[PDB]
Symmetry: T
C-alpha cells in the first residue's frame, strides 16, 4: 500500500516499544510504544484540526 504502518510510526527509541518507563508510562510515547514519522505527524495534525476530536 502507498501508506503502510511503518510509513506512519516507528518503535519508540526510549522504551524500545514497551511503552513503559517503570513504574510509569514512557514519557516519550505516552505508553504507545511508538513515535510518529513526518508523514504520520502531517496526517494526524490535519485530522485533529478539522475534526478537533
Amino acid at each position: 500500500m502507498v501508506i503502510a504502518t511503518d510509513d506512519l510510526e516507528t518503535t519508540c527509541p526510549n522504551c524500545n516499544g514497551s511503552g513503559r518507563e517503570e513504574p510509569e508510562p514512557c514519557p516519550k510515547c505516552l505508553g504507545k510504544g511508538v513515535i510518529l514519522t513526518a508523514q504520520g505527524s502531517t496526517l494526524l495534525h490535519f485530522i485533529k484540526k478539522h475534526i478537533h476530536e
Copy 2:
C-alpha cells in the same frame, strides 16, 4: 488523487451496499454498505490509536 475513496473502502459483499440485513443493520459493515480495504484499515487504525477518540 493519490488516495481515492475506492482505495479506502469497497462495497460490502453481504448486503451488496444497502447496509441492511432487514429488519436489522448488516453485521459485516455495521450499516455503512461498505467494508475497508487493507489501506483504509491501516489508516483508520492509526488515527483511532493516536487520537483515541
Copy 3:
C-alpha cells in the same frame, strides 16, 4: 446473564484473535481481534445512532 460477551462478538477467524496481519492491523477486525454478531451489530448501531460519538 441475558446477554453475554459471546452473544455480542466472536473471535476474528482471520487473525484468530491477535488483531494482526503483520506488518499491518487485520483488515477484517480492524485490529480488535473480534467480529460482531447480529445482536452486537443491532445494539452498537442503535447506540451510535442516538449518541453519535
Copy 4:
C-alpha cells in the same frame, strides 16, 4: 435475537418517519424519523450515564 431494533425504536408519530416538519427538522425525533421505546430509553440512559460521551 433477544433485543431487536423494533424493541429499541419506533416510527416517529409526528413526522411518520420523514424526520421533517418543513422547512425544519421534526422537533420530536430531531430528524431521525424514529423515537425510543421504553427498552431503548433504558439502555441508552445507562450507556450515556456511564460514558457520558
Copy 5:
C-alpha cells in the same frame, strides 16, 4: 435575551419534569425532564450536523 432557555426546551408532558417513569427513565425525555421546542431542535440539529 434573544433566545432564553424556555425558547429552547419545555417541561416534558409525560413525566412533568421528573425525568422518570419509575422504576425507569422517562422514554419521552430520556430522563432529562424536558423536551425540545422547534427553535431548540433547529439549533441542536445544526450543531450536531456540523460538529457531529
Copy 6:
C-alpha cells in the same frame, strides 16, 4: 422562530446540494450539500471553541 435553518446554512453552489463530485465527496461542503451562512458560522465557531 428567531433563527431558522435557512438562516444557518444554504445550498452548496459547487455540487448544487448533492454533496458529491463523483466519485468523491464535494470538497466544498464535505458531502453535506450545504455551506454555512455568516450567522451559522458565528454560532458554530462559538460552540466548537467553548466545547471542542
Copy 7:
C-alpha cells in the same frame, strides 16, 4: 422489559446512593451513586470497546 435498570446497576454500598464522601466524591462509584452488575459491566465494556468514545 427484558433488561431493566436494576439489571444493569444497583445502589452503592459505600455511599448508599449519595455518591459523596464529604468533602470528596465517593471513590467506589466516582460520585455516580451506583455500582454496575455483571450484565451492566458486560454491555458497557462492549460498547466502549467498539465506540472507544
Copy 8:
C-alpha cells in the same frame, strides 16, 4: 445578524484578552481571553446538556 460574536462572549477583564497570567493560563477565561455573556452561557448550557459531548 441577530446574534453576533459580541452577543455571546466578551473580552476577559482579568487578562484583557491575552488569556495568560504568566507563566500560567488565566483562571477566569481558562486561557481563552474571553468570558461568556448570559446569552452565550444560555446557549452553551443547552447544547452541552443535550449533546453532553
Copy 9:
C-alpha cells in the same frame, strides 16, 4: 491527598453554589455552581490541550 477538591474548585460567588440565576444558568459558573482555582485552571487547560475533547 496532595490535591483535594477545594484545591481545584471553589463555590461560585455569583450564585452561591446554586448554579442558577433564574430563569437561566448562572453566567459565571455555566450552571456548575463552582469556579476554578489557579491549580484547577492549570490542570484543566493542560488536559484539554493534549486530548482536546
Copy 10:
C-alpha cells in the same frame, strides 16, 4: 512525503489565511484560515464516517 500539508488544504481565498471577517469568524473556513483540497476532503470524509468524530 506521499501526502504533504499543501496536498490536503490550502489558504482560504476569502480571508487570505486570517480566518477572520471582522468582527466575525470567516464563514468560508470557519476561522481555520484554510479550506480543503479534494484529497483532504476525501480523507476527512472517510475518517469522520468510520469514527464519526
Copy 11:
C-alpha cells in the same frame, strides 16, 4: 514524582489485575485491572465535570 501512577490507581482486588472474570470482563474494574485511589477519584471527577466529556 509528586503524583505517581500508584497514587492514582491500584490493582483490582477482584481479578487480581487481569481485568477479567472469564468469560466476561471484571465488573469491579470494568476490564481495566485497576481501581481508583481517593486522589485518583478526585482528579477524574474534576476533569469529567469540567470537560463534561
Copy 12:
C-alpha cells in the same frame, strides 16, 4: 501551586516552541510547541485510560 504548567510540559527541542518544521508541523510535538514531562505523561495517561474520550 503544587503542579505548575512547567511541571507538566516543556519546550520542544526540535522546533524550540514554534511547532513547525516548515512547510510541515513539527513531528516531535505534533505542532503544539511543547513536549510532556514524566509527571505530565503520567497524568495524561491516567485521564485518557479512565475516560479515553
